[PDB]
Amino acid sequence: TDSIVKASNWRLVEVGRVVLIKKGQSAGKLAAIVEIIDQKKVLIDGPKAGVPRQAINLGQVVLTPLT
């Protein structure tokens, strides 16, 4: 037989990851993560939905499965 593990993948944060702004002034639009500041916050930009380029805490966005 062959070795079996449960992979348990989830939604890595990196550049090009599409996120949905959960709360704030945008509050429901899509953005793309441009760069990673630190463990807790990232620089995003949402230029089609009208989200200005900004640094934002990761607790204010939800990561989508889109990359």
Partner: protein
């Protein structure tokens, strides 16, 4: 300091198969099988290419990345214990009264009994954990061999047999009598 990614590897030989659902590890090899619950340690496993498995922790503290190398060593010990086995050799040490060690059966449970340790009338009985086989070795005087798959079970049984022969109310640097583990190794050492 919140190390955001630390990661260890375990090598899987050709004979064994490792199955990891949530954090329950089952290792199956030529000598048998072993299992381990690891739901207390909070890591993640990932099979790479059916002979390598990475274990990782993300955003971990100092204690957490210590536990990562600990759990790597535990699962690697399980793999090498089901491939090569584990063998502990212990020696009998006495000055005047010879230690007389046999195997008895109260209700079919394979007890190891120890008689005449420093000449006492008390009989010390240590139980035998399952999966551990005990042979009184020939051609070396006063030597007992405990073999098995689980290093935990074998070394704990050897330690119980060592701790059952402690000397009370005497200078133990002079009264050196006892049963002490002299060798730890594999059943198929230098394979």
């Amino acid at each position: 300091m919140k190390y955001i990614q630390t990661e260890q590897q375990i090598e899987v030989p050709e004979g064994v198969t490792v199955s990891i659902k949530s954090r329950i590890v089952k290792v199956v090899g030529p000598r048998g099988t072993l299992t381990k619950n690891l739901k207390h340690i909070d890591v993640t496993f990932t099979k790479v290419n059916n002979q390598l498995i990475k274990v990782a922790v993300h955003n971990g503290g100092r204690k957490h990345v210590a536990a990562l190398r600990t759990v790597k060593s535990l699962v690697d010990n399980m793999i090498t214990g089901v491939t090569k086995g584990y063998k502990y050799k212990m020696r009998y040490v006495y000055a005047h009264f010879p230690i007389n060690v046999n195997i008895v059966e109260k209700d079919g449970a394979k007890f190891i009994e120890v008689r005449n340790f420093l000449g006492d009338k008390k009989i010390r009985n240590v139980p035998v954990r399952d999966g551990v086989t005990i042979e009184f070795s020939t051609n070396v005087k006063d030597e007992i061999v405990l073999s098995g798959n689980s290093v935990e079970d074998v070394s704990q049984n050897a330690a119980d047999l060592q701790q059952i022969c402690r000397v009370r109310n005497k200078d133990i640097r002079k009264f050196l009598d006892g049963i002490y583990v002299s060798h730890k190794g594999f059943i198929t050492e230098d394979l």
